[PDB]
Amino acid sequence: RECISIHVGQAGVQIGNACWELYCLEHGIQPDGQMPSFNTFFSETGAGKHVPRAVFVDLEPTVIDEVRTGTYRQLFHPEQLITGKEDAANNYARGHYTIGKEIIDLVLDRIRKLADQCTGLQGFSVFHSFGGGTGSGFTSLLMERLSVDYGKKSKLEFSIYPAPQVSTAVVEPYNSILTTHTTLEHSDCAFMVDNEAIYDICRRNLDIERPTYTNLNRLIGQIVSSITASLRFDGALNVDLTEFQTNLVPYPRAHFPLATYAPVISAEKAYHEQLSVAEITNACFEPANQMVKCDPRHGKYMACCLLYRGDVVPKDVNAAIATIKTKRTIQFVDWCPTGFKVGINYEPPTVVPGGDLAKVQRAVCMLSNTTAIAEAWARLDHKFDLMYAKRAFVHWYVGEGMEEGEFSEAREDMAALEKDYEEVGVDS
Amino acid sequence: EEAPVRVALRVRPLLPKELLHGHQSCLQVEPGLGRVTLGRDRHFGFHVVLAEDAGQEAVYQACVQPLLEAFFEGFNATVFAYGQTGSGKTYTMGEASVASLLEDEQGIVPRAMAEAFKLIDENDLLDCLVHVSYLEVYKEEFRDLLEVGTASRDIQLREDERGNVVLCGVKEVDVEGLDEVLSLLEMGNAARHTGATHLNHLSSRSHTVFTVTLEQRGRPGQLLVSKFHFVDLAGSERVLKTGSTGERLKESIQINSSLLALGNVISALGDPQRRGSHIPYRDSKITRILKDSLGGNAKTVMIACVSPSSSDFDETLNTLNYASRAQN
Amino acid sequence: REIVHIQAGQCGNQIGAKFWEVISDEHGIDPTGSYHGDSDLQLERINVYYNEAAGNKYVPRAILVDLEPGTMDSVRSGPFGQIFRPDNFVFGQSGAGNNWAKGHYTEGAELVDSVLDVVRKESESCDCLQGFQLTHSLGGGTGSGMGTLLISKIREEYPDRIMNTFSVVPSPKVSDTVVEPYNATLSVHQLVENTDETYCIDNEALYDICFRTLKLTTPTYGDLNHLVSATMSGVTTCLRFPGQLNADLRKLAVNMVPFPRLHFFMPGFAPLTSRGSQQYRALTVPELTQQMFDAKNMMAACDPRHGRYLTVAAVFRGRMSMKEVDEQMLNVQNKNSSYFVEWIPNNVKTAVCDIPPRGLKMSATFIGNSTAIQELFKRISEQFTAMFRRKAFLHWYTGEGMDEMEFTEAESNMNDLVSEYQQYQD
Numbered sequence A: 001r002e003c004i005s006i007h008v009g010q011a012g013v014q015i016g017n018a019c020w021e022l023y024c025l026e027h028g029i030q031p032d033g034q035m036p037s038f039n040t041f042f043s044e045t046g047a048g049k050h051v052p053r054a055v056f057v058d059l060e061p062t063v064i065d066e067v068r069t070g071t072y073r074q075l076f077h078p079e080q081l082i083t084g085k086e087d088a089a090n091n092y093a094r095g096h097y098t099i100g101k102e103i104i105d106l107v108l109d110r111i112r113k114l115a116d117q118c119t120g121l122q123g124f125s126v127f128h129s130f131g132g133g134t135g136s137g138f139t140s141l142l143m144e145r146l147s148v149d150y151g152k153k154s155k156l157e158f159s160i161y162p163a164p165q166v167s168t169a170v171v172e173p174y175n176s177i178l179t180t181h182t183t184l185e186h187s188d189c190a191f192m193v194d195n196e197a198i199y200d201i202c203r204r205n206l207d208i209e210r211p212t213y214t215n216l217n218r219l220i221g222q223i224v225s226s227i228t229a230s231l232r233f234d235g236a237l238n239v240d241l242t243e244f245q246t247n248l249v250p251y252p253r254a255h256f257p258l259a260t261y262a263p264v265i266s267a268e269k270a271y272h273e274q275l276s277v278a279e280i281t282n283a284c285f286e287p288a289n290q291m292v293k294c295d296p297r298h299g300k301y302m303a304c305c306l307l308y309r310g311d312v313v314p315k316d317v318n319a320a321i322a323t324i325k326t327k328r329t330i331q332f333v334d335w336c337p338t339g340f341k342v343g344i345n346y347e348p349p350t351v352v353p354g355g356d357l358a359k360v361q362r363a364v365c366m367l368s369n370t371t372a373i374a375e376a377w378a379r380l381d382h383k384f385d386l387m388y389a390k391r392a393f394v395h396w397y398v399g400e401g402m403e404e405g406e407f408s409e410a411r412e413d414m415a416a417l418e419k420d421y422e423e424v425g426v427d428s
Numbered sequence B: 001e002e003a004p005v006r007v008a009l010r011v012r013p014l015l016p017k018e019l020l021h022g023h024q025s026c027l028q029v030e031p032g033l034g035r036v037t038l039g040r041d042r043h044f045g046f047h048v049v050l051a052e053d054a055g056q057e058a059v060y061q062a063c064v065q066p067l068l069e070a071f072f073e074g075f076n077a078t079v080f081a082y083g084q085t086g087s088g089k090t091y092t093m094g095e096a097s098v099a100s101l102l103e104d105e106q107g108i109v110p111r112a113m114a115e116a117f118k119l120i121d122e123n124d125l126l127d128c129l130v131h132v133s134y135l136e137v138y139k140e141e142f143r144d145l146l147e148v149g150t151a152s153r154d155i156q157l158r159e160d161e162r163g164n165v166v167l168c169g170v171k172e173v174d175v176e177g178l179d180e181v182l183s184l185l186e187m188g189n190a191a192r193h194t195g196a197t198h199l200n201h202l203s204s205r206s207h208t209v210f211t212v213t214l215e216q217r218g219r220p221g222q223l224l225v226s227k228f229h230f231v232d233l234a235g236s237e238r239v240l241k242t243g244s245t246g247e248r249l250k251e252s253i254q255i256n257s258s259l260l261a262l263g264n265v266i267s268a269l270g271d272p273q274r275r276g277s278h279i280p281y282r283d284s285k286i287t288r289i290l291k292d293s294l295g296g297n298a299k300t301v302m303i304a305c306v307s308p309s310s311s312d313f314d315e316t317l318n319t320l321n322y323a324s325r326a327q328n
Numbered sequence C: 001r002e003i004v005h006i007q008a009g010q011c012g013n014q015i016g017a018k019f020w021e022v023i024s025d026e027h028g029i030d031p032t033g034s035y036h037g038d039s040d041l042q043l044e045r046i047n048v049y050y051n052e053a054a055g056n057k058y059v060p061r062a063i064l065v066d067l068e069p070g071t072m073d074s075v076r077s078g079p080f081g082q083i084f085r086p087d088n089f090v091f092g093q094s095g096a097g098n099n100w101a102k103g104h105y106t107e108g109a110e111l112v113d114s115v116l117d118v119v120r121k122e123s124e125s126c127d128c129l130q131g132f133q134l135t136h137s138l139g140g141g142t143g144s145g146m147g148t149l150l151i152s153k154i155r156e157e158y159p160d161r162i163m164n165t166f167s168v169v170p171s172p173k174v175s176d177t178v179v180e181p182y183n184a185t186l187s188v189h190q191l192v193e194n195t196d197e198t199y200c201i202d203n204e205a206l207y208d209i210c211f212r213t214l215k216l217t218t219p220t221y222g223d224l225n226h227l228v229s230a231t232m233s234g235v236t237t238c239l240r241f242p243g244q245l246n247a248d249l250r251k252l253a254v255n256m257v258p259f260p261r262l263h264f265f266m267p268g269f270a271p272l273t274s275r276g277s278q279q280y281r282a283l284t285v286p287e288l289t290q291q292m293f294d295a296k297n298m299m300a301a302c303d304p305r306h307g308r309y310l311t312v313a314a315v316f317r318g319r320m321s322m323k324e325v326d327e328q329m330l331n332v333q334n335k336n337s338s339y340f341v342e343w344i345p346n347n348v349k350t351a352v353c354d355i356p357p358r359g360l361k362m363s364a365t366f367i368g369n370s371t372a373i374q375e376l377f378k379r380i381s382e383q384f385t386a387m388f389r390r391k392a393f394l395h396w397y398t399g400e401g402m403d404e405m406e407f408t409e410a411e412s413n414m415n416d417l418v419s420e421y422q423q424y425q426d
């Protein structure tokens, strides 16, 4: 029962650093690779050392070799930190097609080797972006290949969504759409997150004035840990990723939940309040803590799951659930009688040394499939519209071997997706 | 006084290697009413369409004859061969096939040359002499056929203060007899082949350019002149992104980009709806050498050839859309 | 991962002298070839701008070309000249006399052959060539003509490599010789085709900057070239060091090209302040933005506020968070919405390197492309049409054998460029 870690694109590899720091600190694994003392994330050698079942891949060496020169260089095996020698330069054709097809082989072999090392592969996680070049196309290609070779294995991904306001690439719409096609095609459950929402959260509830990528990435690592280590480490009611596929998929296409976490509290803010399960559960549904620039109140809810870490009694969970059911204007679609799943683990959440979050005795992560996400799509499409209104920059992609027909069909496909969200949102 | 450029569409007849392999003419030609449908409802309107077996002289008397007529209009006429690899364009304009068995092997080029000469056999009054130019472009670089070789920087386009295309560095050969025509075309093909690098398999790699040049000035004085062009672009292998891969992929990517550039150019004619500014001509060589061929008082027609199967059905859609807005 | 430098014409030659001096001080290289630095990060990427020779010495991937020996002798006698190896000082013994036709067409080929040989050799000595950067004049003879010929030839040899260049554009108020517009026109006609992108800098704007903003009364070539070198170092400091985003050139290329043909850019550098005021300021992201946006800090002699910005890229140096810089750029895009084109939402792209320049805790460079620069091309065309009308001293160029047709074609292409900028402007 083991999992695989993949990190593509710069945001992806930063996320990797963060989550792996969090893990080693979760289990006393000193950065040297030693653990003077939970083996679904690490394969163990007879020397007392452990290796994380992970891979880092990007077409530009700088960040990877930086990792190779950081503190945690001895945690990883050199067979894993595979790098190219020329990046995708924010171009889907380059990462997906032109260049990445010259690195895909080695990384594919390493994935297959890690699979053969594993006994029962439960699934794997993916981290990349929709805006950056490398983390956009090459990821689509790799997902395509793995869906051919492995298939029924669980395919989990975390795409860093390009924010409507904060943006780093002119072609963010293009990469986003071209990746949207493939992730519709072969992914299983997508948890796309925006930077702006995290910024608001930390500047308001964590109380930072100057958020650096380190903080957002520590948050995301905390998120994925509460997602999976909650099941890898023992608890009360373990709810497997297969039960995730069962619950959070009302239909083969409505697989795009949003992720949220609570509490996000500073050191001083930790005192001057005693935190019950009721208060945090209430807080989970306010848009001010939602990790996507979107309005849950505006949209309607289809499926919800809550996982808890720390000290939790199921009776209070039932109480809070009843409160949430009766109080809010949460329009549960009649095509769902009750879509609440609850999971409880006993491992309390851990604090990162020098981190920005106070230690809490109990925490919740909330996943929710709701129609409101459709909103975001329109924005991109509209933006995309203007670009395709003049065919600016398209030369760079046909200049790398893409077809404007692909742009058209991809827009039609995304339109089908959002319109299907609208349709299934329609009550009978 | 510009009559919008007339369009013409021909379909190529299939081979058993596709007939017994699921390929069928999903399209629907209708030459009498002059239209073509696709699937069950995609009836498109072309004022001239052709069958799948209309003879070279048939398509000639269909479209070329008005062009041979207006060749003396003192304003330039043109025609381009557009479409995909293996789409009969070489056979459409009917060149590079020298066997002289039935004159349906060779088409537009030798037929037009012979008919021009026969129109000279009867009228020799004024001072009017005609020469020809026959080059190729590949990898966005020039390489003449009539010339064996010359560095790119020499052979160049030129624009006069009068605003007209000029070609410098190319080898010039004036024509006086049809034997000379056939021999020079043979050697020009034999010094270029389907492409600069001949090809993987004998069909449409590069862009072949040719031009007939005869002055009949506005009547020693007012120089109002009509010229003509034989331009055959390369193939448009779009769906074969999964096909030609590697070195051949890079070989084809540049011609693909140039084709899409030309499409972007031609698109901005019947679409002045939002801020109808001027046309971006000078982006690429082909667009430059064809800028004169559009608008003003220059005459032009077009030809396209598609495949019956629904394999490149999407490419048929693309070609049809491009040729639709071809108004003016 | 290696970039080769090229300097033609006395201007660009001493400019690159200053520039290499800047980079050497950056990576902590002595004027002798020995390394004296504090952090390994100075060494980690030394390949981008140097090859290694035994004895722990480092050679700049440098090639120097000219038509007069004394300029090369001068730059060799300056500091860090010994860092160059003499195998690269290629030059003739006869000036081009500010004649594009002489430099590009007739006399140049001789040095062209040898320098192209050296380019081949040096390139293949490296592992993976990234691109090339040039520094030369557009009004003078050598740096214009031979620059154009050499760049054409290299682009022929490497069809897909990165071709970027910095070239000084004349101004009506600093014009030196009458042949200025002709060289300008021909250089432009060649750059617009044989190059991926370009930077335009003018001695006029530089004079303004050093005079007013630096409160300097005796501006030498040194400080102007110093600022140009600071810009050139900034545009790649991202690549030369670990960072957060967008360290690559081709990245910036696809970011800054809304259409293939429109690849001209004005640069800007910050912070720039006379030492008297440096005891007051507070270097923050808002301050840097207010400096860079202001037309008073544009290296090109064109007020952008008359046109509208198409694309903008901003690279930052130093320890800064993302949220600050992104919200700052958002506010900037908001308050001045008129000067931007609706064609592209988020007309601004960012890049952050983690290393500050020596002496300032943080810094910023900016590159822009807006149709406004088109006005400067009028400065050519009119002047051009002002002289070409009379064929004034056309005889000099006719002698080398160039035809009126070439000037005609160049002029027409320049007209087309202006027209397309006005198209996209609205």
Ligand SMILES: Nc1nc2c(ncn2[C@@H]2O[C@H](COP(=O)(O)CP(=O)(O)OP(=O)(O)O)[C@@H](O)[C@H]2O)c(=O)[nH]1
Pocket: C008, C009, C010, C011, C012, C014, C067, C095, C096, C097, C098, C099, C103, C137, C139, C140, C141, C142, C143, C144, C145, C168, C174, C176, C203, C206, C221, C222, C224, C225
């Ligand atoms: N900003 C600066 N501009 C300079 C400097 N030196 C020269 N220049 C400008 O460049 C022009 C002269 O440069 P060049 O001699 O390299 C022109 P070129 O070499 O092509 O002519 P020939 O040497 O006759 O072949 C002149 O008009 C100046 O305005 C400088 O130190 N800084």
Ligand SMILES: Nc1nc2c(ncn2[C@@H]2O[C@H](COP(=O)(O)OP(=O)(O)OP(=O)(O)O)[C@@H](O)[C@H]2O)c(=O)[nH]1
Pocket: A009, A010, A011, A012, A014, A060, A087, A088, A089, A090, A129, A131, A132, A133, A134, A135, A160, A162, A167, A168, A169, A195, A213, A214, A216, A217, C244, C245, C246, C247, C248, C251
């Ligand atoms: N959450 C998070 N997002 C990031 C981080 N760094 C960059 N991003 C996002 O990713 C985009 C830029 O991509 P990068 O990851 O910086 O660069 P890349 O695409 O990985 O590689 P290059 O394009 O070659 O630089 C921006 O739009 C950011 O929103 C980070 O540390 N954390």
Ligand SMILES: Nc1ncnc2c1ncn2[C@@H]1O[C@H](COP(=O)(O)OP(=O)(O)NP(=O)(O)O)[C@@H](O)[C@H]1O
Pocket: B011, B012, B013, B052, B084, B085, B086, B087, B088, B089, B090, B091, B194, B202, B203, B204, B205, B234
């Ligand atoms: N309408 C047609 N009439 C006769 N032969 C045809 C026709 N269409 C296709 N063919 C045959 O199919 C082959 C493909 O056509 P080809 O002459 O290669 O044109 P192409 O594919 O456009 N390449 P090229 O014209 O050389 O650039 C030729 O060898 C022809 O013999």
Ligand SMILES: [Mg+2]
Pocket: C009, C010, C011, C140, C141, C142, C143
């Ligand atoms: Mg000089």
